[PDB]
Amino acid sequence: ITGTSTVGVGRGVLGDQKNINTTYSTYYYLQDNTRGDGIFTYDAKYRTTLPGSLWADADNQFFASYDAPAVDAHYYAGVTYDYYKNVHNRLSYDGNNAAIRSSVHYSQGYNNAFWNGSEMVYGDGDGQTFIPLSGGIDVVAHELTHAVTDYTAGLIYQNESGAINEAISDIFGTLVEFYANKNPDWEIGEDVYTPGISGDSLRSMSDPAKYGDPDHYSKRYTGTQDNGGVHINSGIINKAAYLISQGGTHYGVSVVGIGRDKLGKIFYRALTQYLTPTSNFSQLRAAAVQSATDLYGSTSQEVASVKQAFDAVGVK
Template sequence: MGDQKYINTTYSSYYGYYYLQDNTRGSGIFTYDGRNRTVLPGSLWTDGDNQFSASYDAAAVDAHYYAGVVYDYYKNVHGRLSYDGSNAAIRSTVHYGRGYNNAFWNGSQMVYGDGDGQTFLPFSGGIDVVGHELTHAVTDYTAGLVYQNESGAINEAMSDIFGTLVEFYANRNPDWEIGEDIYTPGIAGDALRSMSDPAKYGDPDHYSKRYTGTQDNGGVHTNSGIINKAAYLLSQGGVHYGVSVTGIGRDKMGKIFYRALVYYLTPTSNFSQLRAACVQAAADLYGSTSQEVNSVKQAFNAVGVY
């Protein structure tokens, strides 16, 4: 998105093209051109001079580069090799559909719309969005959280948490907001969601305010705010609904949620079971009488999850 990035490509002497194929990470990172159609994956991205400087190239460069950052984050921070833990290739398609206002993991690859230019810019331009969607793949291969009701809200929160931690890892204007780089280009300072203050965008920040209807698979993008707030408080500390939380920092927070996701959560885990999973993960990592365990309990107390 308007800046310079250095990416790994592959040259074919036979065809005389450079491909968006990074062979330095796992089984490779491959980025495809959807050509505004909806057939996946599309064609592997090619370029004649290895510069990828055309405006049409930007979405592909972002998807390719940020997929590499997400791979590096999971490998270097958590010792995880790609989303499946076994170095699966990471495939992304950009320019999916026309003015398509979404991005998604379809079970085998990443897909990014270009946005309509008003509500959204091309989705691959947000590193937290790329981290969010690829974390859905990690969740698929670990806890397998069912995408409905509380388990679905945990699924969404895990993607917001690790999408944000990837953004901090890359140190690209990091913050506790989700999608700020690609949302409403004409309006400064807003985002899709906030982890530090979910209520800013109408999401609940306490269990007593949870959504109990049936829309959005039982409010998976809404009730995730409750868990996002707990994760934020665990990292940064603060007082919320009169409950004081001692922050333990982003790195420890991430390690606790990752361990809970990989070892303790099941497909149907609810919020209360997530709390227990995080308490156990913190005890494993830092000891059962540690400040970290106490802070996990405080953070979930603060959002009304027991």
């Protein structure tokens, strides 16, 4: 759309009030012109046909309960752009300020969200397993980081390379959650998952085993489901990345933490310089040690904490 950039106010999935960047041209659109080539949010109207319609509002006020998932997807996609730009110097997911598209209200009671190769897509949840999935900032950034991986390492979505694909989306989803300072933790999907039960979440980085996922390489899943367990085996990498950041003794191996800024920037470098579409866990260990070397020196503590974390998880 061509029009005048302006600012609206809305309420998100969790009832919080926020200002969002809109574009005025007879209606007010969910089009944000201030970031790259724009951030566009679309109404999928409970269908499965994408993208849907670009979101149009009469008065630039987004307080209807139908509005909520659109306010959050549009807002959080903004924060995520800002994290990659400000922290890593990356302009959009392609590095060239590509436009960022999301659709909300996809299907009926659809308990998932995904990146389809061109766009992000958010279910509303059935009301009991989930509530509308864009209400989670770690969920939004997990999704946007899949676009980042696609343009860079290209990690094939199956077996080990797939699980590394998933861990990368969890890791940067959490770093965006700490970036925004929005009640941040080392869990995934907590703000949106099971509104009935308090204190849980989809996956844990700090203790994957809490939900039954492997936290050590010998406990790797080897069958066939979940594309060879891409959402399962990512537990092993998630635990490594948690240890590098925070520190700890895990299966009797001790790791000093080097914190979350260095974590992200060892991972971002591994991702953009060293990883390839078929990389396995033990190539991720080489890439991460090589990154930390580049950045901090061969006999840094940073290099040493990377080696310990991967030993602690049985990866090499």
